[PDB]
Amino acid sequence: SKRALVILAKGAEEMQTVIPVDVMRRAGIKVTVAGLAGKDPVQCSRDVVICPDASLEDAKKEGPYDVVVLPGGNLGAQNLSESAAVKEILKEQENRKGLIAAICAGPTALLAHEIGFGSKVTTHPLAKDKMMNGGHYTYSENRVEKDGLILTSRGPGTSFEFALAIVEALNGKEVAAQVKAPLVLK
Amino acid sequence: SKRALVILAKGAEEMQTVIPVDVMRRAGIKVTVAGLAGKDPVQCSRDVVICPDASLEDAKKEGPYDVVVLPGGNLGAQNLSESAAVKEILKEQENRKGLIAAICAGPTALLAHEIGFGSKVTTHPLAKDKMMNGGHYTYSENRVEKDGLILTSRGPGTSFEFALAIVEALNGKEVAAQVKAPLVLK
């Protein structure tokens, strides 16, 4: 019913890509893993190679999505931050008041594309200074932060909590709890 | 320095594949993701498609490994359990007293191949009855269990703890702690 776009760039943190994709699919969300650079396999930060479902070029024409998800990894987030296609997608999503979810270094692409200024956000500790350049967000050390349509989180180890927050926002608390139980979370 | 073989079968739980691969690479372990059925892309349980580094046929000739890792997912574990190549690898590993690490339904392939009988093990709760058929193991509800060379764990949400246990066994506690810190674990 609900639809998610996960934008996959070279150098993405593969845990932060796969955990949300998997958890959202467990929730019955229709997820498109879209390759930033095309439909070719993407080499992630720790050398896991993932085959996208679609190119971003194609996926962005099949909008709109109920959530747009930006994985982290510094190098993946730098690619997201440099992309005109990402900018357009995120601007459209913000303008239609749809959810934008970003983890680790991922939120730094929000800064690059001027998305969600004034929001409370978290990032990976090592991405804080980049995110806070110019003081356009208020920083949080919460494991997951949500300020309206801007949902952010910190790292590989917050990925389940991030994904479940997306599920809760889209499909509600009951679905999130049902999905969570078989995961054997702490 | 240390080397890990991760055996990737169709229907594997992709979180349980990627979290250990990534965490072990963070630890400086040399990891080979080996496709059970060949070097072709593998469709995992929640439709993430991963490109293996090597076929299992090729990787098994480049042994031996300091750990052999079996991801879970019921359907992936059933494929592992049905494979003669997996049997031979695990028998060799047991005979050379090398580490064998399995998560979720993964440990059920140990039962199939008669590996490590008499050990204390955990599995996913839904795989317990399968693992315990014949009473050849003693069951534990610990999130990670280790009995000599047999290291087991429960589910997606225990994957970080599982991977870090592998790192501790191979490279020691200090390396595991160093790797853990930037993950932002609970």
Cβ-contact A13, A45 below 8 angstroms: yes
Which of B15, B25, B140, B145 best tests the A interface by mutation, with the highest count of A CBs <10 A?
B15
| Integer Cα distance of A49 and A55 in angstroms | 15
Cβ-contact B21, B51 below 8 angstroms: no
Amino acid in the structure at residue A91: K
> Which of B91, B23, B21, B22 lies closest to B63 in space, CA to CA?
B91
Q: A99-133: string of b/e by CB count within 10 Å (b at 16+)?
A: bbbbbbbbbbbbbbbebbeebbbbbbeebbebbbe
Under 8 Å CB pairs connecting chains A and B tally to 95
Sheet containing A49-51, strands listed edge to edge, beginning at the edge strand earlier in sequence = A42-43, A49-51, B49-51, B42-43
| Integer Cα distance of B19 and B156 in angstroms | 9
| Integer Cα distance of A79 and A73 in angstroms | 10
Give the orientation angle of helix A14-26 with respect to helix A159-171, to 10 degrees: 30
Closest chain B CA to residue A19 = B15
CB A177: neighbour CB atoms within 10 A?
Answer: 12
Rg of chain A in Å (alpha carbons):
15
Task: List alpha helices for chain B, DSSP H.
Answer: 14-26, 56-59, 74-81, 84-95, 108-112, 128-131, 159-171, 173-180
Question: Quick one: which H or E segment has residue A76?
Answer: helix A74-81
- Contacts with A19 from chain B: Cβ below 8 Å: 15, 19, 156
Tell me the domain boundaries of chain B.
Answer: 1-186
CB within 8 A of B154, min separation 6: which ones?
A: A184, B103, B104, B122, B123, B124, B125, B143, B144
Cβ-contact B131, B124 below 8 angstroms: no
- Which whole-number Å values give the CA distances from A41 to A55, A139, A160, in the listed order? 10, 34, 24
What one-character DSSP code corresponds to residue B143?
Answer: S
| Integer Cα distance of A74 and A107 in angstroms | 10
Beta bridge pairs of residue B68: B5, B100
User: Judged by CB atoms within 8 Å, which residues 117-146 of A form the interface with B?
Assistant: 124-126, 143
CB B114: neighbour CB atoms within 10 A?
Answer: 12
Beta bridge pairs of residue A51: B49
CB within 8 A of A120, min separation 6: which ones?
A: A137, A138, A139, A140, A145, A147
Structure tokens of B109? Answer: 């392939």
Q: Is the peptide bond before A182 cis (omega within 30 degrees of 0)?
A: no
Beta bridge pairs of residue B50: A50, B42
Give the orientation angle of helix B14-26 with respect to helix B159-171, to 10 degrees: 30
| Integer Cα distance of B16 and A166 in angstroms | 21
| Integer Cα distance of B124 and B154 in angstroms | 4
- Contacts with B184 from chain A: Cβ below 8 Å: 124-125, 143, 154-158
Q: What is Dmax (Cα atoms) for chain B?
A: 42
Cβ-contact A20, A159 below 8 angstroms: yes
| Integer Cα distance of B186 and B176 in angstroms | 15
Contact check, Cβ <8 Å, A155/B184: yes
Tell me the resolution in Å: 1.4
Question: Quick one: which H or E segment has residue A99?
Answer: strand A99-103
- 3-state secondary structure (DSSP) of residue B76: helix
| Integer Cα distance of A164 and B50 in angstroms | 23
Return the sign of the alpha-carbon dihedral for residues A40, A8, A13, B52: negative
Cβ-contact B138, B50 below 8 angstroms: no
- 3-state secondary structure (DSSP) of residue B89: helix
Contact check, Cβ <8 Å, A157/B183: yes
- Considering the segment(s) A1-186 as one domain, its CATH architecture is 3-Layer(aba) Sandwich (3.40)
- Give yes or no for A30 touching B (CB within 8 A): no
The approach used to solve this structure was: X-ray
Cβ-contact B154, B103 below 8 angstroms: yes
The C-alpha torsion from B51 through B110 and B67 to B175, rounded to 10°, is 100
- Give yes or no for B171 touching A (CB within 8 A): no
Cβ-contact B138, B119 below 8 angstroms: yes
Contact check, Cβ <8 Å, A48/B49: no
